[PDB]
Design a protein around this ligand. Sequence first.
Ligand SMILES: *[C@@H]1O[C@H](CO[C@@H]2O[C@@H](C)[C@@H](O)[C@@H](O)[C@@H]2O)[C@@H](O[C@@H]2O[C@H](CO)[C@@H](O[C@@H]3O[C@H](CO[C@H]4O[C@H](CO)[C@@H](O)[C@H](O)[C@@H]4O[C@@H]4O[C@H](CO)[C@@H](O[C@@H]5O[C@H](CO)[C@H](O)[C@H](O)[C@H]5O)[C@H](O)[C@H]4NC(C)=O)[C@@H](O)[C@H](O[C@H]4O[C@H](CO)[C@@H](O)[C@H](O)[C@@H]4O[C@@H]4O[C@H](CO)[C@@H](O)[C@H](O)[C@H]4NC(C)=O)[C@@H]3O)[C@H](O)[C@H]2NC(C)=O)[C@H](O)[C@H]1NC(C)=O
Ligand SMILES: *[C@@H]1O[C@H](CO[C@@H]2O[C@@H](C)[C@@H](O)[C@@H](O)[C@@H]2O)[C@@H](O[C@@H]2O[C@H](CO)[C@@H](O[C@@H]3O[C@H](CO[C@H]4O[C@H](CO)[C@@H](O)[C@H](O)[C@@H]4O[C@@H]4O[C@H](CO)[C@@H](O[C@@H]5O[C@H](CO)[C@H](O)[C@H](O)[C@H]5O)[C@H](O)[C@H]4NC(C)=O)[C@@H](O)[C@H](O[C@H]4O[C@H](CO)[C@@H](O)[C@H](O)[C@@H]4O[C@@H]4O[C@H](CO)[C@@H](O)[C@H](O)[C@H]4NC(C)=O)[C@@H]3O)[C@H](O)[C@H]2NC(C)=O)[C@H](O)[C@H]1NC(C)=O
Lengths: 214, 216
Amino acid sequence: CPAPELGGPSVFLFPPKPKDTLMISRTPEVTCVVVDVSHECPEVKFNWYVDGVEVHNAKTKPREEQYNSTYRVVSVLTVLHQDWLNGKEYKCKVSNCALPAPIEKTISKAKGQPREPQVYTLPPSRDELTKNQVSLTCLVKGFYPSDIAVEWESNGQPENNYKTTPPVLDSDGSFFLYSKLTVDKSRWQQGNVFSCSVMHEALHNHYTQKSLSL
Amino acid sequence: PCPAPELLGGPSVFLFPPKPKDTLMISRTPEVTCVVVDVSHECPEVKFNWYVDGVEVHNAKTKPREEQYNSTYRVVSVLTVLHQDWLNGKEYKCKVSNCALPAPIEKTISKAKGQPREPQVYTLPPSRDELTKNQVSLTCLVKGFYPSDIAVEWESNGQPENNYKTTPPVLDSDGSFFLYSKLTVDKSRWQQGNVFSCSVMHEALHNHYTQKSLSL
Ligand SMILES: *[C@@H]1O[C@H](CO[C@@H]2O[C@@H](C)[C@@H](O)[C@@H](O)[C@@H]2O)[C@@H](O[C@@H]2O[C@H](CO)[C@@H](O[C@@H]3O[C@H](CO[C@H]4O[C@H](CO)[C@@H](O)[C@H](O)[C@@H]4O[C@@H]4O[C@H](CO)[C@@H](O[C@@H]5O[C@H](CO)[C@H](O)[C@H](O)[C@H]5O)[C@H](O)[C@H]4NC(C)=O)[C@@H](O)[C@H](O[C@H]4O[C@H](CO)[C@@H](O)[C@H](O)[C@@H]4O[C@@H]4O[C@H](CO)[C@@H](O)[C@H](O)[C@H]4NC(C)=O)[C@@H]3O)[C@H](O)[C@H]2NC(C)=O)[C@H](O)[C@H]1NC(C)=O
Ligand SMILES: *[C@@H]1O[C@H](CO[C@@H]2O[C@@H](C)[C@@H](O)[C@@H](O)[C@@H]2O)[C@@H](O[C@@H]2O[C@H](CO)[C@@H](O[C@@H]3O[C@H](CO[C@H]4O[C@H](CO)[C@@H](O)[C@H](O)[C@@H]4O[C@@H]4O[C@H](CO)[C@@H](O[C@@H]5O[C@H](CO)[C@H](O)[C@H](O)[C@H]5O)[C@H](O)[C@H]4NC(C)=O)[C@@H](O)[C@H](O[C@H]4O[C@H](CO)[C@@H](O)[C@H](O)[C@@H]4O[C@@H]4O[C@H](CO)[C@@H](O)[C@H](O)[C@H]4NC(C)=O)[C@@H]3O)[C@H](O)[C@H]2NC(C)=O)[C@H](O)[C@H]1NC(C)=O
């Protein structure tokens, strides 16, 4: 597919996954994505800075050919958990020949007092017990920033059949969301215990669990 | 299919659907709004053609171009649509012509395709643990609806209760959508026993409207 352009290409910069910054064990990554990379000029150069200090541990993924006859070059910067949580600024400077001037883009965590999420499990409506599957609701509210991970389990095994809304801005400038775990109605009435797990900066050990059962 | 060639020196087109509530209530007026921005001073003249299922229509209302502070014009055309045409999945095409374009820009919009699915509406009282706080969360779960166009509201004694927030529709595993709406009320107003109603407006409901009540 022919679709050339000229500045040159666009840069997009993405933060780490909430979960990855909140557990020491995980590897949080800031990601600099370059699109609209031409063929006459498909080599890409990356500079990375942490609070204006250059760092060199960036890894560049191999080019991936796009439907519209452009290239997509991605550079991945592993970050220190506490750096990201302490609000350090990450700069991705992109040099390509189609750019007279380097493109600089900067991201950091949302600013301001972290706020503890309140976690409340809600059993199915009596009206839903007619169906063969029921809705186990986890309300998470009062949290800031919006960065959060929600998970579900029973007998310390991950429940797979859940969906979680994105965070929504509340009137107080806090965030809330809802996570819906869908189970066979029998499992509910049989009285199996279900856990809603929430990971967030403003929790002790960055973790809480509210249990739910008949 | 490959996309039509775009250019920066030329204008841009944005085409906006009716509001969900506007198509579901015969008393309201649903509209499709075609907005052209970045119209150059040197080519200010804008031509709109409108098509319903590729059949040109003539009843659209076009407003005088109005200058922005960045020294480009923004031009708007409004097509009133018949409620039953939108809900019967008709395709609304805006065609925009300008000397700064190699060819006219075409944009299309319609209700998302597929068999409508009735929303199930379930009210959930505040958690035991939330009763220690001064304000409590009245929860309205709406699941199994298609398409994602829906309106949700709250009320008590037939008076709108406005201290609520509603999640976007979320794609569910069965290809249907769900959302939650959170109404926030003083714990007092819940404990005295006042009655709160969660209202859902959707295509696949009888008369496009249901209500599920909630109280102590
Ligand atoms: C040529 O084609 C390519 C691609 O074509 C594609 O394939 C074909 C078949 C089609 O299907 C086509 O539609 C496809 O896209 C075109 O490339 C695109 O270029 C545009 C820019 O023009 C990019 O648009 C931006 O998208 C941003 C979000 O992108 C993510 O989400 C989408 C899904 O919706 C994905 O497609 C992307 O890949 C991104 O996905 C994310 O990628 C991250 C990096 O890996 C992931 O995070 C990482 O995840 C990994 C593992 O997954 C690790 O955990 C890492 O730790 C972690 O970092 C992330 O999970 C993943 N997320 C998701 C959601 O999946 C938008 O942010 C951005 O919006 C801004 O900019 C727009 C203007 O350009 C503007 O209109 C918007 O309003 C918004 O503007 C901003 O608004 C904010 C306020 O919110 C302001 O603060 C900002 O200042 C403001 N910015 C600006 C600039 O004004 C863009 O919309 C598009 O993503 C990109 N696609 C890809 C794949 O790269 C190319 O354009 C074509 N060329 C031409 C000329 O046509
Ligand atoms: C010069 O200025 C002009 C004008 O700006 C103004 O003046 C300047 C000086 C400033 O003061 C500025 O603050 C002023 O606003 C600039 O014009 C802008 O151009 C940009 C594009 O460059 C437009 O950006 C798009 O915005 C869309 C959202 O638009 C609405 O929402 C914003 C607020 O978020 C409003 O400000 C807009 O006015 C729009 O508002 C809507 O208006 C509708 C029409 O009236 C309303 O609907 C109707 O409402 C009535 C009642 O009111 C009835 O209900 C009718 O029934 C109903 O139809 C509606 O209420 C209202 N909405 C809201 C929420 O208020 C974005 O949608 C759009 O995004 C798409 O495209 C991007 C790429 O361009 C992409 O990144 C996005 O992801 C998204 O991509 C699309 O995704 C969709 C699905 O999501 C797909 O269909 C497509 O595949 C895909 N498209 C593409 C192209 O790939 C853009 O971000 C901006 O709207 C516009 N402003 C205005 C006011 O017109 C101009 O840029 C300046 N020029 C220069 C060079 O600087």
